[PDB]
Design an enzyme around this catalytic site. Structure first.
Site, PDB file in Angstrom:
ATOM      1  N   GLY A 143       0.774  -1.219   0.000  1.00 15.84           N
ATOM      2  CA  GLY A 143       0.000   0.000   0.000  1.00 15.84           C
ATOM      3  C   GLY A 143       0.812   1.279   0.000  1.00 15.84           C
ATOM      4  N   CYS A 145       3.423   1.906  -2.145  1.00 15.47           N
ATOM      5  CA  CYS A 145       4.118   2.139  -3.400  1.00 15.47           C
ATOM      6  C   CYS A 145       3.624   3.402  -4.087  1.00 15.47           C
ATOM      7  CB  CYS A 145       4.026   0.928  -4.318  1.00 15.47           C
ATOM      8  SG  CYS A 145       5.111  -0.392  -3.743  1.00 15.47           S
TER       9      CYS A 145
HETATM   10  C1  LIG Z   1       3.948  -1.670  -3.327  1.00 12.58           C
HETATM   11  O1  LIG Z   1       3.089  -1.985  -4.174  1.00 12.58           O
HETATM   12  C2  LIG Z   1       4.732  -2.836  -2.692  1.00 12.58           C
HETATM   13  C3  LIG Z   1       5.443  -2.458  -1.391  1.00 12.58           C
HETATM   14  C4  LIG Z   1       6.124  -3.634  -0.675  1.00 12.58           C
HETATM   15  C5  LIG Z   1       5.248  -4.786  -0.195  1.00 12.58           C
HETATM   16  C6  LIG Z   1       6.028  -5.364   0.977  1.00 12.58           C
HETATM   17  N1  LIG Z   1       6.729  -4.189   1.491  1.00 12.58           N
HETATM   18  C7  LIG Z   1       6.842  -3.213   0.592  1.00 12.58           C
HETATM   19  O2  LIG Z   1       7.435  -2.134   0.758  1.00 12.58           O
HETATM   20  N2  LIG Z   1       5.649  -3.371  -3.684  1.00 12.58           N
HETATM   21  C8  LIG Z   1       5.651  -4.652  -4.061  1.00 12.58           C
HETATM   22  O3  LIG Z   1       4.850  -5.485  -3.643  1.00 12.58           O
HETATM   23  C9  LIG Z   1       6.722  -5.045  -5.069  1.00 12.58           C
HETATM   24  C10 LIG Z   1       6.160  -5.019  -6.493  1.00 12.58           C
HETATM   25  C11 LIG Z   1       7.227  -5.176  -7.547  1.00 12.58           C
HETATM   26  C12 LIG Z   1       8.217  -4.222  -7.710  1.00 12.58           C
HETATM   27  C13 LIG Z   1       9.195  -4.367  -8.681  1.00 12.58           C
HETATM   28  C14 LIG Z   1       9.190  -5.464  -9.509  1.00 12.58           C
HETATM   29  C15 LIG Z   1       8.213  -6.418  -9.362  1.00 12.58           C
HETATM   30  C16 LIG Z   1       7.234  -6.274  -8.391  1.00 12.58           C
HETATM   31  N3  LIG Z   1       7.238  -6.354  -4.738  1.00 12.58           N
HETATM   32  C17 LIG Z   1       7.904  -6.545  -3.583  1.00 12.58           C
HETATM   33  O4  LIG Z   1       8.166  -5.605  -2.824  1.00 12.58           O
HETATM   34  C18 LIG Z   1       8.233  -7.928  -3.233  1.00 12.58           C
HETATM   35  C19 LIG Z   1       8.153  -9.106  -3.933  1.00 12.58           C
HETATM   36  C20 LIG Z   1       8.588 -10.135  -3.059  1.00 12.58           C
HETATM   37  C21 LIG Z   1       8.733 -11.530  -3.168  1.00 12.58           C
HETATM   38  C22 LIG Z   1       9.195 -12.237  -2.084  1.00 12.58           C
HETATM   39  C23 LIG Z   1       9.508 -11.608  -0.883  1.00 12.58           C
HETATM   40  C24 LIG Z   1       9.385 -10.245  -0.735  1.00 12.58           C
HETATM   41  C25 LIG Z   1       8.923  -9.519  -1.830  1.00 12.58           C
HETATM   42  N4  LIG Z   1       8.698  -8.175  -1.963  1.00 12.58           N
END
Ligand SMILES: *C(=O)[C@H](C[C@@H]1CCNC1=O)NC(=O)[C@H](Cc1ccccc1)NC(=O)c1cc2ccccc2[nH]1
Length: 179
Positions: A143, A145
């Site tokens: 949430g 991003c």
């Molecule tokens: C915003 O949408 C979100 C913020 C994240 C969620 C957990 N803590 C945060 O700060 N971003 C995401 O979910 C990204 C999306 C992304 C970004 C770039 C390329 C592809 C996808 N993904 C992650 O942060 C993410 C993926 C995974 C997989 C395994 C373990 C941890 C991960 N984090």
């Protein structure tokens, strides 16, 4: 100090919803705004519960053709964002003691002290590469991003990811927003 972050919240940072959920949008100048790429803005986007047509969208890559995790969109509106390009550095820039500015329906008008924003570079999340990232040692969450990374009157990054304990942003440089 919250003053700079507040000025951006008033004039540039908006609560949005796409088919991927809730995000913070940064308006940069004119009708041009930036979102995290994975928000996948479509032909329309919800900006603070108003349906807004998207005239154009570009998913930015670096010169090696690798994802930067930023999408530039042009909104179909007569409103103009106050031009903040002067606050975006010419080069990708680290920062100390930054404030991450979030504005969604779930996290309204939020100022998050994330500490220093440090060089990271090539980052892989969900198997997908991103270049020009930076890291902060703060447990960012789903949430958040699109959140805007600010420090000492500079706008240096857009929040894109995290692992539960650290957070990661896509770096901003001024030329991304040039016409
Ligand atoms: C915003 O949408 C979100 C913020 C994240 C969620 C957990 N803590 C945060 O700060 N971003 C995401 O979910 C990204 C999306 C992304 C970004 C770039 C390329 C592809 C996808 N993904 C992650 O942060 C993410 C993926 C995974 C997989 C395994 C373990 C941890 C991960 N984090």
């Amino acid at each position: 100090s919250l003053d700079f972050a507040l000025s951006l919240l008033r004039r540039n940072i908006r609560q949005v919803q796409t088919d991927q959920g809730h995000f913070t949008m940064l308006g940069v100048r004119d009708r041009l705004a930036v979102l995290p790429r994975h928000s996948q803005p479509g032909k329309t986007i919800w900006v603070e519960h108003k349906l807004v047509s998207v005239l154009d969208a570009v998913e930015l890559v670096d010169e090696q053709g690798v994802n930067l995790e930023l999408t530039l969109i042009t909104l179909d509106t007569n409103e103009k964002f106050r031009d903040i390009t002067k606050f975006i550095p010419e080069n990708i820039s680290t920062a100390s003691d930054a404030t991450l500015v979030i504005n969604t329906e779930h996290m309204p008008s939020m100022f998050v002290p994330v500490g220093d924003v440090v060089q990271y570079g090539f980052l892989n999340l969900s198997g997908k590469p991103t270049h020009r990232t930076m890291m902060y040692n703060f447990p960012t969450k789903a949430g958040q991003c699109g959140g805007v990374v600010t420090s000492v009157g500079k706008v240096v990054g857009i929040h894109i990811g995290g692992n539960g304990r650290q957070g990661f942003c896509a770096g901003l440089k001024r030329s991304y927003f040039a016409s």
